[PDB]
Symmetry: C3
Subunit: 154 residues, 3 copies
Amino acid sequence: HHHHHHKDEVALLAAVTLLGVLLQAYFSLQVISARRAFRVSPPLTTGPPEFERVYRAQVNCSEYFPLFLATLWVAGIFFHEGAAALCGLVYLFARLRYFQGYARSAQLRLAPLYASARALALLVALAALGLLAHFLPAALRAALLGRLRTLLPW
Amino acid sequence: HHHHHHKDEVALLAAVTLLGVLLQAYFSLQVISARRAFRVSPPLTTGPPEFERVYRAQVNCSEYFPLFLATLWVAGIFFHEGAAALCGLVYLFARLRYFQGYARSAQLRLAPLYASARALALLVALAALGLLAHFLPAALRAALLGRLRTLLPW
Amino acid sequence: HHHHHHKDEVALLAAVTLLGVLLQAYFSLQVISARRAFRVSPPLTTGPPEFERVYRAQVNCSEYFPLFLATLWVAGIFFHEGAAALCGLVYLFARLRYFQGYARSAQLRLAPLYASARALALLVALAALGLLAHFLPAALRAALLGRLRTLLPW
Ligand SMILES: CCCCCCSC[C@H](NC(=O)CC[C@H]([NH3+])C(=O)O)C(=O)NCC(=O)O
Ligand SMILES: CCCCCCSC[C@H](NC(=O)CC[C@H]([NH3+])C(=O)O)C(=O)NCC(=O)O
Ligand SMILES: CCCCCCSC[C@H](NC(=O)CC[C@H]([NH3+])C(=O)O)C(=O)NCC(=O)O
Ligand SMILES: CCCCCC/C=C/CCCCCCCC(=O)O
Ligand SMILES: CCCCCC/C=C/CCCCCCCC(=O)O
Ligand SMILES: CCCCCC/C=C/CCCCCCCC(=O)O
Ligand code: NI
Ligand code: NI
Ligand code: NI
Ligand code: NI
Ligand code: NI
Ligand code: NI
Ligand code: NI
């Protein structure tokens, strides 16, 4: 304390973040369940195709989850919190579908994969635009000022 | 600047975070050390059971580390910083024990694994409660207001 | 809102963060491209040495990316934003070189690997120093105060 909080500026990003964590946890329990169904004991991550697909779905989601988080927060802070949260929700939903698809067949992972990549790319673009909005004016001003300069003439 | 900082509201979360990083680094050096002991050269992540166990312990910890971070921060901001840090400390300790256990035997990874999952689940519950506390009143109010509405009667 | 923002205190950390995301994405597209070149279809992460090297380069980078993020932010907030961003830039550049090297040969991954580890270690040290600066005075004061205590004597 501090007589103000910035919780209000980030609660939706936080809610989507927690939702993402819960979804990852879900994936983990699904991998353990495939480990019982197809009798694959730790360590060792090879087995029947269906296990390898479930396993691999969880691994890919894990690898993308920090990318999602980073961009979600940057976009939400630099561009717009609500838009970022929406894209995040779409992303996470796409990822749930990716995992389910993959579990059934490699080919069925593909449509939700593409959906998830577009949402992520949108998040990136918002992050980039937000950062650009932050930095570009001061930079342009500094460049104009140096040019100015001229002076003691004109 | 800014004539105030919010460092004070997050320093314990930050300290636990750094501690978590250091522990992950430690795991990494342990995997490289198992790579020398059992002669496994990159790439390739298969070898004797003990190497595969050490390797796999490091991989699982890596996969859970972002989940831990996300929830630690949400819990610490939305619920209570100290509680979140404590759960985080317990989690990380549980994880150190998980890795050591696993290195010795798959079965010995199990007790600290369960300890780590409970701490994580507690962190999730705090995150959830904190978010609920943030959103639920305004929502309930908005719902009551819409009902009210009635009016120009009663 | 809130009539101030802390975007200004973190924009460089955010820019480096986004840059890191873009680099990871790049690595991902490189793995998919190696999957087409050497005909390796999902799931299954074994194949010719060059594929396994590209794959493995992407995996290692993925595993270190959250460590990098955590420390980058802690260092940037607790120590100095600009220094942290610089180290981050060096780190990410080192990582680009690590991935390219690895893709060509296991041995060529080694020099940029070491460069990346030093930048990361520097980030850790800054995080640690920043945290120490935050906590150590109050602690020392509290300890001196308890000693003081004496009193009603001296
Ligand atoms: C908005 C920009 C986002 C970047 C997308 C880049 S390509 C997609 C991405 N490719 C990878 O992750 C490559 C590595 C992955 N670990 C693998 O073994 O295939 C993927 O979905 N891999 C898993 C899959 O193919 O299902
Ligand atoms: C509080 C909620 C947290 C969610 C816990 C879900 S189950 C535990 C978790 N399961 C997984 O990670 C599955 C995937 C893992 N990569 C594997 O190959 O087994 C685990 O500890 N795997 C490694 C292990 O079994 O040691
Ligand atoms: C500043 C402190 C940072 C900590 C560095 C610790 S050692 C380096 C690190 N070792 C590991 O990641 C071990 C696990 C890795 N997954 C593997 O299979 O080799 C690495 O670069 N592995 C990949 C590689 O050797 O290229
Ligand atoms: C590791 C991933 C990145 C996490 C970074 C999140 C940091 C947030 C700090 C700034 C919060 C201040 C309020 C936001 C300002 C605004 O909404 O315009
Ligand atoms: C990617 C993981 C999530 C990281 C998010 C952390 C963002 C912090 C921004 C808000 C900080 C403001 C002070 C906290 C307010 C409080 O303690 O009540
Ligand atoms: C999960 C990785 C860690 C993310 C944490 C980032 C949280 C930032 C909250 C505090 C921001 C307030 C401004 C910084 C104060 C300063 O620069 O001295
Ligand atoms: Ni104040
Ligand atoms: Ni006060
Ligand atoms: Ni403030
Ligand atoms: Ni101010
Ligand atoms: Ni001033
Ligand atoms: Ni204000
Ligand atoms: Ni106002």
